[PDB]
Amino acid sequence: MNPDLRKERASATFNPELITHILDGSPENTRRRREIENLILNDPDFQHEDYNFLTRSQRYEVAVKKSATMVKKMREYGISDPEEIMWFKNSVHRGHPEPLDLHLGMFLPTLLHQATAEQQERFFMPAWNLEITGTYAQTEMGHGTHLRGLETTATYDPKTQEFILNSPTVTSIKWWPGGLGKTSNHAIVLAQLITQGECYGLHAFVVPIREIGTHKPLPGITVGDIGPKFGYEEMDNGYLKMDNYRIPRENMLMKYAQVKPDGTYVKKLTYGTMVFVRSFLVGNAAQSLSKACTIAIRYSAVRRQSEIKQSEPEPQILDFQTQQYKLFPLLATAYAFHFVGRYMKETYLRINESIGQGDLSELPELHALTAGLKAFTTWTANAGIEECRMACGGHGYSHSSGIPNIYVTFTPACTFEGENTVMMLQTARFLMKIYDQVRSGKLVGGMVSYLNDLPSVDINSLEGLTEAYKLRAARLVEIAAKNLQTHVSHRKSKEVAWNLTSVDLVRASEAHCHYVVVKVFSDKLPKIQDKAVQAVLRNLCLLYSLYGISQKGGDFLEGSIITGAQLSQVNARILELLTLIRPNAVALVDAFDFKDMTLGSVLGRYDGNVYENLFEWAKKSPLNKTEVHESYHKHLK
Amino acid sequence: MNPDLRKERASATFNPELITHILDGSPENTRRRREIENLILNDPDFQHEDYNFLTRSQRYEVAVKKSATMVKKMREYGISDPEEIMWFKNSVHRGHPEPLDLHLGMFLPTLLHQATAEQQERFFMPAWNLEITGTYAQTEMGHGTHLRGLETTATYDPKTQEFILNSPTVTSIKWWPGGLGKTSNHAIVLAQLITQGECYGLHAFVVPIREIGTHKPLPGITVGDIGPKFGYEEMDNGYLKMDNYRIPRENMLMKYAQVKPDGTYVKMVFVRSFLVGNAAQSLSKACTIAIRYSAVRRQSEIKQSEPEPQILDFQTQQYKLFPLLATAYAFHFVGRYMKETYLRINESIGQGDLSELPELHALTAGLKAFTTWTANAGIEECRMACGGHGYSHSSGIPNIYVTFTPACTFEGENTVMMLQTARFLMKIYDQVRSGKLVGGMVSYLNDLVDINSLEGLTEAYKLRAARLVEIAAKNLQTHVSHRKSKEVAWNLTSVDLVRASEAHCHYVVVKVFSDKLPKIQDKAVQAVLRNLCLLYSLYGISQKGGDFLEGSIITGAQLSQVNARILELLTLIRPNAVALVDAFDFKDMTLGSVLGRYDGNVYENLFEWAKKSPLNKTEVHESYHKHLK
Ligand SMILES: Cc1cc2nc3c(=O)[nH]c(=O)nc-3n(C[C@H](O)[C@H](O)[C@H](O)COP(=O)(O)OP(=O)(O)OC[C@H]3O[C@@H](n4cnc5c(N)ncnc54)[C@H](O)[C@@H]3O)c2cc1C
């Protein structure tokens, strides 16, 4: 390997393999994930020309065959555990999105959970070999966040006992569903149920959209791809227009609501529904940030440029303080998000045990924390990925860095499972609700128990830093509450008040979530058995928290949480941590255990042999298919 | 038009035309710019299918076709004024980069300002009928920022009287030059001059790389495209490897240094100013789209009873877009300021007065980094403020983002630039330390409160700048003191130094924006810009409250009033949002945005766009039969 990377790995003060165990959950987990990864790696059926060297059409085509192959292979290998299916799918698509995401993630799961025996035989079973391919169509051109505003109608017809699915306007057309564009022949559509002159709200219906065998669109059906996007080249995000399309009455999912043959409309928290409330975007954020950091840091250890001292030769750019400042706080963030994502997993499991005991008390906080962490981590990871890219200089801009694809692939996560701003406002509804409760004399519990200490620190220890974040969260919640009451007590409608306090409310949710990450990171440390590993993660933990304090110094000063002098100490300690982390930077990134193939990066290769490979890469790219480009003869010659 | 956009326009308290006048510098500049943009809009030779519906190869091809026609068309129309050239070229490529960029910006300009009668005869003249297509090759795979690290050599050969251009290592291969991939048959190459066993530094040579008429790479010449990037699809950024490749000794640009047959060796600010304008323009486009779309898009609710409101009515939406709108105008003004400044200092240089040249270099480097980094993040905020729809190329913001973002790394990597600014700031600091009075925009360092006034806010930025410079200076001393080494000390203080330059530059933008108001003749226009200026200043104080609180420049109670004033200002700006974006005068064609269309008729046009998308050439995709069946 490149002498420069070898030098970095030799300076590491800890064994990176021990951290990999921690990330996967156990040594055993690491082995299994690697085993599954190697199944795809050495399988030529999963190999193909570099995504970036292919047109959009060819990219979608490649994704399709790999997904089709993926299904057959997972069936044959007997991979049923959801975690293992995740690892397997990750290795096959290398973080890239694929056309069977909704089919496997929402279509089959919804049928398995709510469909009747006859329905599953008609819609679930035929999918085993993809005879049937489905997707979930909810979003419309005119409504994404505001569901109640959806326009698709499903009117019951007593005479023929079938539903009439209709897209009355341009805005009503379904828009975005992955696989809806060209892959799926069936789609579970969400529509406003209409029967006996009454609208009963949103209900789901199984609707065939393409003829089996020929894949031609069925009469009354209009489907297609929505066009090119920032990223997602391999995903056929689509649109669906239904011209008073008829389907059997038995195609409605009736586990919760039913429609009798005469048109009469009739009418719990389970482990079943809980699987749907589950989210993996926090882990997704951690992972994407990690990939970017791995690339940027390795490259920064490989790239030599400029000079620190005129007498010495060009140093590694990772020797520059500004370089370390750009990347080490993000590396610490990457780790913080991994621990938070693991905490959430733990919580889901803790919550099921509570539900099984009849205790639904922590559900409100779960839903608020879930919406909050999702927005906090996705936004932070989003910006962090681009910093990593720009930290690589000009080469970061080339697809050979691998970062532009990571960013473009990850960024819509700020939209998935609820707009980030809307989600933060959801977290704020809960924070205000708990605040009002404490106001009326109730002692509250949970991560939000600090509210019991309203109304409104040793900056050197982890405990004092956690406390500082706790106090800052309390302070921002207090500011939002008071400001909210000022509008209300001004005779304004609770709603107008809400809007006029929304910026403040989002900030309260943000502060709350940041405090949660810090506490979770800090709580992790005492549980690390290996002292060397513990020491490094501690430095990363100190950097994450100190850096957050510097980033929003105003929050801590305004609340008199820290003094101006303490802010100076915080800033100084941050610079000191950068160098303490420096000798371990590479090994910390190696611990993420990404294979070159997943990274899709010349610059971030494990071996550090960037330059020779960067040249081969460019020479094999499409514009060099010929020495002279036809445009020459036609317009220049 | 969409009645939602017309009611937004009807509520405007000023005439947008007057702001366009201010943006173009004068009413006549507008009329003239709008003339050119029309020469092109109605010309079939510049029409083609949406770039986003084409492959990388087809994009490059369309760019090449348009640029070639561009040169012919300009010459024939009489467009030679380099300003009118920007407008024309901007309309033609609809804001996208083009393969003749270096040819017109570096090749010709360099020849025209350094070539001899013989050279300007066989090099400059041919680049008339594009007979010759050239580019400038500086950057190498191994070096971009630190030029004296370049490896390309030009070893003079006394016997045959010709320089030998060589790429000894993989890292020495030229990398990135636009037009170097498949467009140019000639390239001015920057290389280490070596003659008579001695290296004399970097010098520029003109080297033919492709055979005229066939475009075949010449013997010893290896050329090609460097591959696909985040953006720049229509640009053939390339690589050049020269294997002991010989060129007439007479091919060296000897305007400043010469090499006779004996082998005896003898004897940037405008571009950064351009990028600041490029930052303002890109930010403006994004804002125009995001704001127009926010007035068109209705969703969710405020009051239970009322119908879905335009998302522009949500405070959060206003908070995301109005501060950025104010930033776009702020950046346009500081850009104009930079222009006035370099023109003035240029005039001094000519009279032997170079007293303001160091500040000019420093300010120009700092503002470039400050505005490009700010606009960069702002373009993405505009995209995300559009919801999922923003992610689609139908929003046109992703292309804007991808096209503008490299501005943060080329022409001086932002952090390196800020570091240069900091070097100047420290010098000035040491100068006042010695007891000297300094002038210029930095005269506030000779001195080493009211949140409700324009003057007080400007004053607040001044002190914040002074405070950060002082913190950097103090930390720098503390390090030279403890570490006893200047280079090590500089490095351990570099984050503080960058922060001080950022603070200095922010102060400049505010001050410039503020000094611009009294010069506005129309009262209504002056009134709206004033709100944007207050928003800009107040927003920055909130964003980095700790800087002001730390320096006892503002109290906690004042920070609170700042935040309250920002919210109030969003409200006061709301009624003028669309008109303020309309003022930019961007045409639908150069915006390439369905969501930001001037008429506001989004949805109907959106479906048509998707319907026309490449993946819908057929109802069923080929991949179905061969894989999913
Ligand atoms: C890559 C990608 C893939 C997708 N895949 C799928 C898929 O497979 N299936 C599917 O069903 N959908 C999919 N979608 C659509 C996604 O579900 C929607 O984008 C999401 O629901 C938000 O809808 P919208 O974009 O119209 O947002 P809108 O809410 O209409 O607009 C967003 C803007 O309005 C603001 N806003 C909205 N309501 C409020 C409020 N009450 N208060 C304050 N601010 C508010 C937002 O914060 C934001 O600035 C995808 C989108 C993308 C980009």
Ligand SMILES: Cc1cc2nc3c(=O)[nH]c(=O)nc-3n(C[C@H](O)[C@H](O)[C@H](O)COP(=O)(O)OP(=O)(O)OC[C@H]3O[C@@H](n4cnc5c(N)ncnc54)[C@H](O)[C@@H]3O)c2cc1C
């Ligand atoms: C779209 C695009 C188009 C381009 N077009 C052209 C073109 O037409 N012609 C051309 O010649 N070039 C072109 N380039 C190359 C561009 O000029 C270089 O990328 C730029 O000069 C920066 O060089 P670098 O990428 O090697 O940076 P590097 O410096 O190698 O790396 C950047 C990183 O190193 C850090 N760093 C470097 N030096 C220092 C220092 N002294 N102190 C502290 N930190 C430091 C930076 O802060 C940053 O994080 C283009 C690049 C792009 C992306």
